[PDB]
């Protein structure tokens, strides 16, 4: 019966994507049932047996009983023993034996050797094959289809093959129901490529061909193509919850390995961001790894500045609070800190009174909470605000510089800065001002800015609307993208140069993935796109090999720049230690001037060489050309 | 600073290690032949003076106190430390050869500890297998999983415990898989021609 489920559902589906779909409501039902029936019979490991059944019924004669009872015995074994999760049919064995007792018979039993040849890489051999085929099937047709414009392409089809038009009529009908083909392709993609971290570098070639598809209809396909194509590059979510679990409990149950500290510096100088998963366990139950993990989160947030004192507290209804004491390295002098891990806001309201019991306001205090409830961020934080205005008693208790609330599952931050400032801060809502001087966020104060949530949270993307007065309506709409890079350091002997090229290229591909998402999404005409890079290592390379490195990069990408139309990039990187703020200057055309400065006292001043825009201060709001 | 290079357990290693050689040296010269001749070998090892000898004689005189207490010391530091450092075990393997009724408790604690300091790490390999299974199992979409199960079924490492914490974890694939890996790894000697998973009315897999 499954054999019929197969031919029926498959012919229907290849007919789906041949164009024969009818534009009516029933489509969304018919194809949906059809598709699940496919997938289900595709997981069901009785397909290959039933098709070699079906051929082996039609070659009942001409038969050597040795090879038939051999293949048929051991399939029977496979059928009884199929309730194991990992059993596949003796493919290679049957091929060898057939080739041994074999060519009249060979030319009567050909269909099986080609069946087994399709069937060598398993039932997920098929899961590869079918979608891969469909992909180039879709691909050739719809890539030739919009290789310029509909008319010219159809006229080139007419004259390249003037003699016949049947391919043309099936073509015209098919891309007539293109949106149906295309939507349903997304559907198929969604429930296979929608969640599969493993993928074999054989498909991705076709996918990178597939991403270039340039039309309004192929815009879902484009965002899924990219989101999937990257997805593999941040896998194993619960796996790294397991790896950090291991590192912490093993390293810490003795906390004297001496290699624990080496792993801890790899934890606090890990290029991969673990602010995703780290919150789920730093409120597990073992007070030491609690403490360690929690302060490691602090240390990894404001990791940029220098800390000269850190004391662990352990207080009444037991709860461990840490206190910090540090100072600024020239941001704009000293301050302390507090981290507290709490389970629910209710409890916070109860155990309040000892938290300021054991506490110019010079304290930073950030509290991590779970928040798998009170789903509305606005009733949520609104309550939080009127908690501050009901009890500023915290402020009466020797004052706090800032109180940030961290609500967990990318955690939504809720920053409340105020002794005389207005309380809740909106420029910084949904983010923790860790690196905040670094993201020079006052240099965009001439703007109305919208926090956009985004994957790969390393990569923070900002939307800029030129803020103008009521008298006139805005002309500029620029994408700013500011990223973060949290690496340890690099040793010399030219290790850095290769690193710069490879990491820059990878990050740049991520950046164009983002601006691509920006095009696909609603898009409006950006002019002066921004790239922000914080290199936190300290290489000893030269400035002029930095200039060749940025030369090789920018030169390497040509048209690509002009399509995404990226106009501004800034880095710093400390070398021998001096700082060098490189700011890139390119207008229409690919001609580019590189601006290198110096930071000099008394309000610090970017000063070149000779560099354009020599003399200005640092909080320069962004020109709205 | 010279004691202080290898840390706070730089000290817990170092001091006891010294004490160990103190015990070791004394009682190794003590037993080689028989008590009298050995004391005569002491006469000639330090022919000129015998004060070291008298302190020696005094020390192994109250051996049983020393001996119990050596066991004690090992017990409340090396009583549990599968973390092993390539500096003690040399002295310890010297220590294992000690061949007398008096030096008879020390041998089983020294060795039994020194052995459980070998490969297993029960909760560590429960963690490694935790990884293998959960990593392998969200879609079993690896294909190299089969290669790792054949490494389990042709595994040098012993795995034979019961693993109660996951063997009733309620996820139908790891249910089925784990149970049959137990079957297969039990009855590995014979030839298998058929295996069916069943599924009672509620939620138990046979």
Curated annotation (Swiss-Prot), chain A:
Where is this protein localized, as stated in its record?
A: Cytoplasm, Cytosol
Q: In which tissues has expression of this protein been reported? A: Expressed in brain, placenta, skeletal muscle, renal, pancreatic and adipose tissues; expressed at low level in pulmonary tissue; not detected in the liver.
Give the free-text PTM comment from the record: The biotin cofactor is covalently attached to the central biotinyl-binding domain and is required for the catalytic activity.
Query: Per its UniProt entry, which superkingdom is the organism in?
Result: Eukaryota
Q: How does it assemble?
A: Monomer, homodimer, and homotetramer. Can form filamentous polymers. Interacts in its inactive phosphorylated form with the BRCT domains of BRCA1 which prevents ACACA dephosphorylation and inhibits lipid synthesis. Interacts with MID1IP1; interaction with MID1IP1 promotes oligomerization and increases its activity.
Q: What is known of its domains?
A: Consists of an N-terminal biotin carboxylation/carboxylase (BC) domain that catalyzes the ATP-dependent transient carboxylation of the biotin covalently attached to the central biotinyl-binding/biotin carboxyl carrier (BCC) domain. The C-terminal carboxyl transferase (CT) domain catalyzes the transfer of the carboxyl group from carboxylated biotin to acetyl-CoA to produce malonyl-CoA.
Disease affiliated with this protein: Acetyl-CoA carboxylase-alpha deficiency: An autosomal recessive inborn error of de novo fatty acid synthesis associated with severe brain damage, persistent myopathy and poor growth.
Give the function comment from the record.
Cytosolic enzyme that catalyzes the carboxylation of acetyl-CoA to malonyl-CoA, the first and rate-limiting step of de novo fatty acid biosynthesis. This is a 2 steps reaction starting with the ATP-dependent carboxylation of the biotin carried by the biotin carboxyl carrier (BCC) domain followed by the transfer of the carboxyl group from carboxylated biotin to acetyl-CoA.
Name this polypeptide is given: Acetyl-CoA carboxylase 1
Phylogenetic lineage: Eukaryota, Metazoa, Chordata, Craniata, Vertebrata
Whichever gene encodes this chain, its name is ACACA
């Amino acid at each position: 019966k499954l054999h019929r489920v197969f031919h029926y559902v498959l012919d229907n589906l290849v007919n789906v994507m041949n164009g024969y779909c009818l534009p009516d409501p029933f489509f969304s039902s018919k194809v949906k049932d059809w598709v699940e029936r496919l997938m289900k019979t595709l997981r069901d490991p009785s397909l290959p047996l039933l098709e070699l059944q079906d051929i082996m019924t039609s070659v009942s004669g001409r038969i050597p009983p040795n090879v038939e009872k051999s293949i048929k015995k051991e399939m029977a074994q496979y059928a009884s023993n199929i309730t194991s999760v990992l059993c596949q049919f003796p493919s290679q064995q049957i091929a060898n034996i057939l080739d041994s007792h074999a060519e009249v018979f060979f030319m009567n039993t050909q269909s099986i050797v080609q069946l087994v040849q399709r069937y060598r890489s398993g039932i997920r051999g098929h899961m590869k094959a079918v979608v891969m085929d469909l992909l180039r099937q879709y691909l050739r047709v719809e890539t030739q289809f919009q290789n310029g414009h509909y008319d010219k392409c159809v006229f080139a089809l007419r004259e390249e093959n003037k003699s016949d038009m049947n391919t043309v009529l099936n073509y015209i009908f098919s891309h007539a129901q293109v949106t149906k083909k295309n939507l349903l392709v997304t559907m198929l993609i969604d429930q296979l490529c929608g969640r599969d971290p493993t993928l074999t570098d054989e498909l991705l070639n076709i996918l990178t061909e597939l991403t270039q598809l340039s039309k309004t209809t192929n815009a879902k396909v484009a965002l899924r193509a990219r989101q999937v194509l990257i997805a593999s590059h941040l896998p194993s979510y619960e796996l790294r919850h397991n790896q950090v679990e291991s590192i912490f409990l093993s390293a810490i149950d003795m906390y004297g390995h001496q290699f624990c500290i080496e792993n801890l510096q790899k934890l606090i100088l890990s290029e991969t961001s673990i602010f995703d998963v780290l919150p789920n366990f730093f409120y597990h139950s073992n007070q030491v790894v609690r403490m360690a993990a929690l302060e490691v989160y602090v240390r990894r947030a404001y990791i940029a500045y220098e800390l000269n004192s850190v004391q662990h507290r352990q207080l009444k209804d037991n709860t461990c609070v840490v206190e910090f004491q540090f100072m600024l390295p020239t941001s704009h002098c000293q301050r302390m800190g507090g981290m507290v891990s709490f389970r629910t806001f209710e409890d916070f309201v109860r155990i309040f009174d000892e938290v300021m019991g054991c506490f110019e306001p010079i304290h930073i205090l950030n509290v991590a909470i779970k928040t798998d409830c009170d789903i509305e961020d606005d009733r949520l934080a609104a309550m939080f605000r009127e908690f501050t205005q009901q009890n500023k008693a915290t402020l009466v208790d020797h004052g706090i510089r800032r109180l940030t609330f961290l609500v967990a599952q990318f955690p939504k931050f809720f920053t409340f800065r105020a002794r005389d400032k207005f309380e809740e801060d909106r420029i910084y809502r949904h983010l923790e001002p860790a690196l905040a001087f670094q993201l020079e966020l006052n240099r965009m104060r001439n703007f109305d800015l919208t926090a956009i949530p985004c994957a790969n949270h390393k990569m923070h993307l900002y939307l800029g609307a030129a803020k103008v007065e009521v008298g006139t309506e805005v002309t500029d709409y620029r994408f700013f993208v500011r990223a973060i890079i949290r690496h340890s350091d690099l040793v010399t002997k030219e290790a850095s140069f290769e690193y710069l090229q490879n990491e820059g290229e990878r990050l740049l591909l991520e950046a164009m993935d983002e601006l691509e998402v920006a095009f696909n999404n609603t898009n409006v005409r950006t002019d002066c796109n921004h790239i922000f890079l914080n290199f936190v290592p300290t290489v000893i390379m030269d400035p002029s090999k930095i200039e060749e490195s940025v030369r090789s990069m920018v030169m390497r990408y040509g048209s690509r720049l002009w399509k995404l139309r990226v106009l501004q990039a800034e880095l710093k990187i400390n070398i021998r230690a001096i700082p060098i703020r490189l700011f890139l200057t390119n207008e229409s055309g690919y001609y580019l001037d590189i601006s290198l400065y110096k930071e000099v006292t008394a309000q610090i001043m970017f000063q070149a060489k000779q560099g354009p825009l020599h003399g200005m201060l640092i909080n320069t709001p962004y020109v709205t050309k």
